[PDB]
Amino acid sequence: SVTLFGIVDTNVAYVNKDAAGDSRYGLGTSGASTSRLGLRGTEDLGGGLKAGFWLEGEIFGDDGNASGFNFKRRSTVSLSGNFGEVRLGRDLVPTSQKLTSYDLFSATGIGPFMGFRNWAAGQGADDNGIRANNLISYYTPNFGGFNAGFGYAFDEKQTIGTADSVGRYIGGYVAYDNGPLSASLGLAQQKTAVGGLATDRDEITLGASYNFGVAKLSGLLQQTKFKRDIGGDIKTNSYMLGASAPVGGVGEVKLQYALYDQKAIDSKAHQITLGYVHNLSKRTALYGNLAFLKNKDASTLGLQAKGVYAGGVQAGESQTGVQVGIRHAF
Amino acid sequence: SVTLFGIVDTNVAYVNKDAAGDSRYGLGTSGASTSRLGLRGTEDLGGGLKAGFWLEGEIFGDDGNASGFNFKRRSTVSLSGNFGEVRLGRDLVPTSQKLTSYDLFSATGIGPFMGFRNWAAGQGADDNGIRANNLISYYTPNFGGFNAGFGYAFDEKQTIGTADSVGRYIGGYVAYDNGPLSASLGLAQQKTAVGGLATDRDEITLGASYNFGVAKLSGLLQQTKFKRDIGGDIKTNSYMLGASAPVGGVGEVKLQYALYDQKAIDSKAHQITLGYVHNLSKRTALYGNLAFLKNKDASTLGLQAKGVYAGGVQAGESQTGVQVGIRHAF
Amino acid sequence: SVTLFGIVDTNVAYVNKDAAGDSRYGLGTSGASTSRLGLRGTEDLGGGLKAGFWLEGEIFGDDGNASGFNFKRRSTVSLSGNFGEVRLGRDLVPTSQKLTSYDLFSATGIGPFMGFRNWAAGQGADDNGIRANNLISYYTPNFGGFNAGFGYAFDEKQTIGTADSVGRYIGGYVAYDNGPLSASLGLAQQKTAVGGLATDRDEITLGASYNFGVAKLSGLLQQTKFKRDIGGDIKTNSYMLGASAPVGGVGEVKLQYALYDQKAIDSKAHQITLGYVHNLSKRTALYGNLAFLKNKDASTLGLQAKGVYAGGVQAGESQTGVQVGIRHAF
Ligand SMILES: CCCCCCCCO[C@@H]1O[C@H](CO)[C@@H](O)[C@H](O)[C@H]1O
Ligand SMILES: [Ca+2]
Ligand SMILES: [Ca+2]
Ligand SMILES: [Ca+2]
Ligand SMILES: [Ca+2]
Ligand SMILES: [Ca+2]
Ligand SMILES: [Ca+2]
Ligand SMILES: [Ca+2]
């Protein structure tokens, strides 16, 4: 079968300050789920073997994809069977695919965990550690709850300054998932450059959650270190704890706290986000996100109101943001 | 339901002069309808409420969309019901959506009304007054013929020179539509800049038509004023009258006259366009457009032979153009 | 009917040297068939007349179409019937459409015939002689084996230096095709520029093949001359002979030899490619290509490992390449 699918998630959003201390408001996107358009298919080859493909790109409903539509979210071909699944092509790397599942705000909107970000202003295409070009991944079956994923992305001799392997990824995870309980440990290294100097991006991530039915609790710890070959490092420890709960048959409330300990500037930022999702149907929801981000000292982090304002703020400033929108899946 | 749809409209076209006085001919597009590719869907949410989405982009069949496919024609999500319809996302603004309906050449090809154009070389993304980014619109039901539409597009602090609200749109229309008779009054203001100086783009548009069955008569008047905050204005009055008629069961003839009174250069341009559409089926037509554009004095307007030549001509020159093509809808 | 179709063909690839003499390896694409995504449709208009359209673009699975999706492979509208077929829009020109059919590696991957390439560093959009913007083509029916195709692409006064008709194409072919036997003669001229000086790109191509069932033999000869108006020429004679055979019910082996006699640098390059395709189903195949390219003297040609390395090599160097991949059609 071949399936056309997508999501259009568009919102109004506001932040009280930008890099100049001025408020911003506007029409933005992707507050509850990332807006997307894709095609996927699966073919039974017999003998339990299946071939697949998946082409997916982000949608920007506020500007009609003004910078041009692509398939940067995923563009894979695969084989799958009793051995698991092997995929070739651009995709989420295994470490982000698995560990972002512990973020109650699904790595989008103003609310989400910010650990997967380019903390060091690395010069690679994907120094947020989320996706990779030139990726091969292998995902095992789940046996008795245990499951794992592994990926390698080729650098293809991409060269920036003294780095001649920019974009290489090697990484994977081990996990236990039984339904209500989930826990995962991810480890990855990317090759990059910072200021034209070869640098490793090392990331270790631990996540766990338990779904009690009446509520779900979820936590994530992560250390990301950009270690420059000649010496020096930009190290960040990121922490998150959240809870969600169904409210009355068609609603869901979510609350998440995060802390970002940015060692290179000896500064912390703390974040609290409250969210609500109200389902009008299985495919259509209204939602609201309210977030507060407190930078200390030299920290300049800003909330990610996509399509409105997602830059930084002045050092040590607190920022408040709101998003209210509709998400429609098809 | 989700519907894939589109139009491929490709033509041969000719103009007798360009900005150097040389003829041009070629393979162009979109002479009878704008070529497009889109997806749209509607979901019944119960209780008379519906959710929708619509993603549509222009097609350029002469070059395979060489500059890259996007969804700039419309990228909305909506809710609709007995209250009307609310849409979020890039789209036609209500004033252009409603008032371009009075142009017998459908705001495309060499023939159409040129009132919705960037008369002042405004620096905004959409200073032709046709579409807007970051748009929210509301369309009422039609009650007893009466209907209205309203839109607001956020500027998001887009800054060019002394303008810090570039791209803002506020506008709407009131109308009467009973089938044979249609009349509408539109009013809109956009924020922009001209030469780096903050400028309002003010537009008032009146249109009416009557469909007698054997023929249709249609007219449009418009004043567009770019009023610069420090003083000065580029004002243009635009007028059009046209008629169409079915010819023999599968044909249609169209004739339209327009005048553009460009106050800032004390010059007028007059235009006459004759068109014919021959239906081979409900979805496939052959067509021809013949146009004559007479610039007086300092006027340099040119016919819009998309994909062939759509620039200006030398001051005071007359230009003739022809387009012959096929339009295929799917 | 309207049909969505495509191919995702992604591979691992290696070449032993690049322009610096270093090996390269990576995740690439399109080793067995060019990866693509398209929509096409046909409408019966009655009386044996049909309207069609076809929109197709290349897919780059290794990077998610990072530079943006388009319809550059084909974006046509057509009419067809007992007279043949007329198409308007960007497409393969008739000479490449017909003559590339003699290449056993289908003008893609490391293995294919390289005759359709920009031998002179022409400055036109399509100086490889493969596709054209602004194209009108006519294809006859096949009567008693005989068939022909003709195309004209408008230049639209595209100007580069002293060339004011850049991109013009005039060309066509005559052929005999009866099933097992195929032979074709193509002739074409394009207008271009080299170093800002007007230049004709003249191409004559002869191809033939015979399919014995147990094996197929195929050959191609081509002369491409870039003849500069003020004098001088970059002339290349290109030759290829290949064979293919089914192996055991789901396999196919292919072997092709080519020679490129580059007169402007008095140098030859020779190429040998071995390929295997193993079908897992009618739509899904695994494949491998192994190629050896020997440059003599000043020749610097390189193998085309798309998405890994497709540049040149140092003068007189031999290069080896390998591609192993999966092709999945839908
Ligand atoms: C950027 C280009 C967007 C590609 C849009 C893909 C449209 C697919 O269209 C879909 O596919 C199937 C085949 O027609 C059908 O089942 C459905 O009618 C349709 O929903
Ligand atoms: Ca897949
Ligand atoms: Ca916006
Ligand atoms: Ca909609
Ligand atoms: Ca053109
Ligand atoms: Ca066609
Ligand atoms: Ca694009
Ligand atoms: Ca690659």
PDB file of all heavy atoms in Angstrom, chain A residues 289-305:
ATOM      1  N   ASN A 289      -0.156  26.329  24.754  1.00  0.00           N
ATOM      2  CA  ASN A 289       1.091  26.190  25.484  1.00  0.00           C
ATOM      3  C   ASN A 289       1.425  27.519  26.145  1.00  0.00           C
ATOM      4  O   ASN A 289       1.272  28.572  25.510  1.00  0.00           O
ATOM      5  CB  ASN A 289       2.231  25.870  24.519  1.00  0.00           C
ATOM      6  CG  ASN A 289       2.054  24.588  23.784  1.00  0.00           C
ATOM      7  OD1 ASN A 289       2.450  24.494  22.591  1.00  0.00           O
ATOM      8  ND2 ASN A 289       1.585  23.581  24.457  1.00  0.00           N
ATOM      9  N   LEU A 290       1.845  27.461  27.412  1.00  0.00           N
ATOM     10  CA  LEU A 290       2.299  28.620  28.164  1.00  0.00           C
ATOM     11  C   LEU A 290       3.649  28.271  28.733  1.00  0.00           C
ATOM     12  O   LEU A 290       3.758  27.288  29.466  1.00  0.00           O
ATOM     13  CB  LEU A 290       1.321  28.909  29.327  1.00  0.00           C
ATOM     14  CG  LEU A 290       1.684  30.002  30.322  1.00  0.00           C
ATOM     15  CD1 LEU A 290       1.847  31.359  29.671  1.00  0.00           C
ATOM     16  CD2 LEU A 290       0.626  30.056  31.433  1.00  0.00           C
ATOM     17  N   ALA A 291       4.653  29.083  28.473  1.00  0.00           N
ATOM     18  CA  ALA A 291       5.995  28.770  28.958  1.00  0.00           C
ATOM     19  C   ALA A 291       6.695  29.967  29.563  1.00  0.00           C
ATOM     20  O   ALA A 291       6.471  31.123  29.201  1.00  0.00           O
ATOM     21  CB  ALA A 291       6.816  28.242  27.839  1.00  0.00           C
ATOM     22  N   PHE A 292       7.580  29.654  30.501  1.00  0.00           N
ATOM     23  CA  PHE A 292       8.378  30.648  31.204  1.00  0.00           C
ATOM     24  C   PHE A 292       9.795  30.130  31.227  1.00  0.00           C
ATOM     25  O   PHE A 292      10.029  29.029  31.699  1.00  0.00           O
ATOM     26  CB  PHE A 292       7.857  30.840  32.646  1.00  0.00           C
ATOM     27  CG  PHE A 292       8.588  31.894  33.417  1.00  0.00           C
ATOM     28  CD1 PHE A 292       8.470  33.229  33.072  1.00  0.00           C
ATOM     29  CD2 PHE A 292       9.400  31.538  34.511  1.00  0.00           C
ATOM     30  CE1 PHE A 292       9.155  34.217  33.800  1.00  0.00           C
ATOM     31  CE2 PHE A 292      10.094  32.506  35.230  1.00  0.00           C
ATOM     32  CZ  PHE A 292       9.953  33.851  34.887  1.00  0.00           C
ATOM     33  N   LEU A 293      10.723  30.922  30.713  1.00  0.00           N
ATOM     34  CA  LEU A 293      12.112  30.574  30.604  1.00  0.00           C
ATOM     35  C   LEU A 293      12.919  31.637  31.352  1.00  0.00           C
ATOM     36  O   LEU A 293      12.918  32.802  31.004  1.00  0.00           O
ATOM     37  CB  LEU A 293      12.538  30.521  29.143  1.00  0.00           C
ATOM     38  CG  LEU A 293      13.936  30.125  28.700  1.00  0.00           C
ATOM     39  CD1 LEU A 293      14.325  28.763  29.213  1.00  0.00           C
ATOM     40  CD2 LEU A 293      14.081  30.169  27.150  1.00  0.00           C
ATOM     41  N   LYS A 294      13.636  31.202  32.386  1.00  0.00           N
ATOM     42  CA  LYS A 294      14.440  32.093  33.205  1.00  0.00           C
ATOM     43  C   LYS A 294      15.909  31.837  32.971  1.00  0.00           C
ATOM     44  O   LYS A 294      16.421  30.798  33.361  1.00  0.00           O
ATOM     45  CB  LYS A 294      14.122  31.802  34.666  1.00  0.00           C
ATOM     46  CG  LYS A 294      14.867  32.643  35.670  1.00  0.00           C
ATOM     47  CD  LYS A 294      14.359  32.278  37.099  1.00  0.00           C
ATOM     48  CE  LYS A 294      13.352  33.283  37.656  1.00  0.00           C
ATOM     49  NZ  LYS A 294      12.087  32.641  38.179  1.00  0.00           N
ATOM     50  N   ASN A 295      16.575  32.778  32.323  1.00  0.00           N
ATOM     51  CA  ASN A 295      18.000  32.732  32.139  1.00  0.00           C
ATOM     52  C   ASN A 295      18.667  33.363  33.349  1.00  0.00           C
ATOM     53  O   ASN A 295      18.233  34.402  33.806  1.00  0.00           O
ATOM     54  CB  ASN A 295      18.401  33.528  30.914  1.00  0.00           C
ATOM     55  CG  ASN A 295      17.923  32.902  29.627  1.00  0.00           C
ATOM     56  OD1 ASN A 295      16.948  33.398  28.964  1.00  0.00           O
ATOM     57  ND2 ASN A 295      18.552  31.832  29.261  1.00  0.00           N
ATOM     58  N   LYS A 296      19.744  32.744  33.804  1.00  0.00           N
ATOM     59  CA  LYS A 296      20.610  33.345  34.828  1.00  0.00           C
ATOM     60  C   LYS A 296      21.922  33.789  34.197  1.00  0.00           C
ATOM     61  O   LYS A 296      22.405  33.221  33.188  1.00  0.00           O
ATOM     62  CB  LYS A 296      20.870  32.340  35.945  1.00  0.00           C
ATOM     63  CG  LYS A 296      19.627  31.813  36.633  1.00  0.00           C
ATOM     64  CD  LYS A 296      18.811  32.896  37.324  1.00  0.00           C
ATOM     65  CE  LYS A 296      19.305  33.169  38.742  1.00  0.00           C
ATOM     66  NZ  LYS A 296      18.487  34.294  39.355  1.00  0.00           N
ATOM     67  N   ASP A 297      22.519  34.824  34.781  1.00  0.00           N
ATOM     68  CA  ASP A 297      23.868  35.236  34.446  1.00  0.00           C
ATOM     69  C   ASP A 297      24.048  35.517  32.957  1.00  0.00           C
ATOM     70  O   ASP A 297      23.379  36.428  32.418  1.00  0.00           O
ATOM     71  CB  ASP A 297      24.848  34.205  35.010  1.00  0.00           C
ATOM     72  CG  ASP A 297      24.742  34.092  36.508  1.00  0.00           C
ATOM     73  OD1 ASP A 297      24.785  35.157  37.160  1.00  0.00           O
ATOM     74  OD2 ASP A 297      24.628  33.008  37.136  1.00  0.00           O
ATOM     75  N   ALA A 298      24.884  34.752  32.265  1.00  0.00           N
ATOM     76  CA  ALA A 298      25.186  35.025  30.862  1.00  0.00           C
ATOM     77  C   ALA A 298      24.278  34.280  29.859  1.00  0.00           C
ATOM     78  O   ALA A 298      24.424  34.407  28.654  1.00  0.00           O
ATOM     79  CB  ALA A 298      26.637  34.717  30.567  1.00  0.00           C
ATOM     80  N   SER A 299      23.383  33.463  30.367  1.00  0.00           N
ATOM     81  CA  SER A 299      22.490  32.682  29.507  1.00  0.00           C
ATOM     82  C   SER A 299      21.518  33.577  28.748  1.00  0.00           C
ATOM     83  O   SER A 299      20.995  34.546  29.301  1.00  0.00           O
ATOM     84  CB  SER A 299      21.750  31.644  30.350  1.00  0.00           C
ATOM     85  OG  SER A 299      20.962  30.775  29.552  1.00  0.00           O
ATOM     86  N   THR A 300      21.298  33.224  27.492  1.00  0.00           N
ATOM     87  CA  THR A 300      20.504  34.003  26.540  1.00  0.00           C
ATOM     88  C   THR A 300      19.486  33.155  25.768  1.00  0.00           C
ATOM     89  O   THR A 300      19.095  33.527  24.655  1.00  0.00           O
ATOM     90  CB  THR A 300      21.401  34.701  25.484  1.00  0.00           C
ATOM     91  OG1 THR A 300      22.230  33.733  24.844  1.00  0.00           O
ATOM     92  CG2 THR A 300      22.323  35.733  26.114  1.00  0.00           C
ATOM     93  N   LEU A 301      19.090  32.017  26.323  1.00  0.00           N
ATOM     94  CA  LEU A 301      18.167  31.120  25.643  1.00  0.00           C
ATOM     95  C   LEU A 301      16.789  31.725  25.461  1.00  0.00           C
ATOM     96  O   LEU A 301      16.264  32.399  26.332  1.00  0.00           O
ATOM     97  CB  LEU A 301      18.052  29.788  26.370  1.00  0.00           C
ATOM     98  CG  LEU A 301      19.344  28.981  26.497  1.00  0.00           C
ATOM     99  CD1 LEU A 301      19.041  27.725  27.286  1.00  0.00           C
ATOM    100  CD2 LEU A 301      19.980  28.640  25.131  1.00  0.00           C
ATOM    101  N   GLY A 302      16.200  31.421  24.324  1.00  0.00           N
ATOM    102  CA  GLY A 302      14.851  31.849  24.030  1.00  0.00           C
ATOM    103  C   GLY A 302      13.922  30.702  23.690  1.00  0.00           C
ATOM    104  O   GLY A 302      14.339  29.639  23.181  1.00  0.00           O
ATOM    105  N   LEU A 303      12.648  30.940  23.925  1.00  0.00           N
ATOM    106  CA  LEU A 303      11.612  29.988  23.590  1.00  0.00           C
ATOM    107  C   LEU A 303      11.463  29.863  22.067  1.00  0.00           C
ATOM    108  O   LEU A 303      11.692  30.821  21.303  1.00  0.00           O
ATOM    109  CB  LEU A 303      10.306  30.410  24.210  1.00  0.00           C
ATOM    110  CG  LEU A 303      10.248  30.445  25.726  1.00  0.00           C
ATOM    111  CD1 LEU A 303       9.028  31.247  26.189  1.00  0.00           C
ATOM    112  CD2 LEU A 303      10.226  29.028  26.264  1.00  0.00           C
ATOM    113  N   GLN A 304      11.013  28.704  21.631  1.00  0.00           N
ATOM    114  CA  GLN A 304      11.004  28.398  20.195  1.00  0.00           C
ATOM    115  C   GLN A 304       9.602  28.542  19.602  1.00  0.00           C
ATOM    116  O   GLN A 304       8.934  27.535  19.316  1.00  0.00           O
ATOM    117  CB  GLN A 304      11.546  26.997  19.997  1.00  0.00           C
ATOM    118  CG  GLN A 304      12.993  26.891  20.465  1.00  0.00           C
ATOM    119  CD  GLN A 304      13.910  27.826  19.744  1.00  0.00           C
ATOM    120  OE1 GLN A 304      14.407  28.836  20.317  1.00  0.00           O
ATOM    121  NE2 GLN A 304      14.168  27.516  18.495  1.00  0.00           N
ATOM    122  N   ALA A 305       9.148  29.792  19.436  1.00  0.00           N
ATOM    123  CA  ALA A 305       7.817  30.047  18.841  1.00  0.00           C
ATOM    124  C   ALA A 305       8.001  30.055  17.316  1.00  0.00           C
ATOM    125  O   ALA A 305       8.204  31.126  16.728  1.00  0.00           O
ATOM    126  CB  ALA A 305       7.222  31.378  19.317  1.00  0.00           C
TER     127      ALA A 305
END
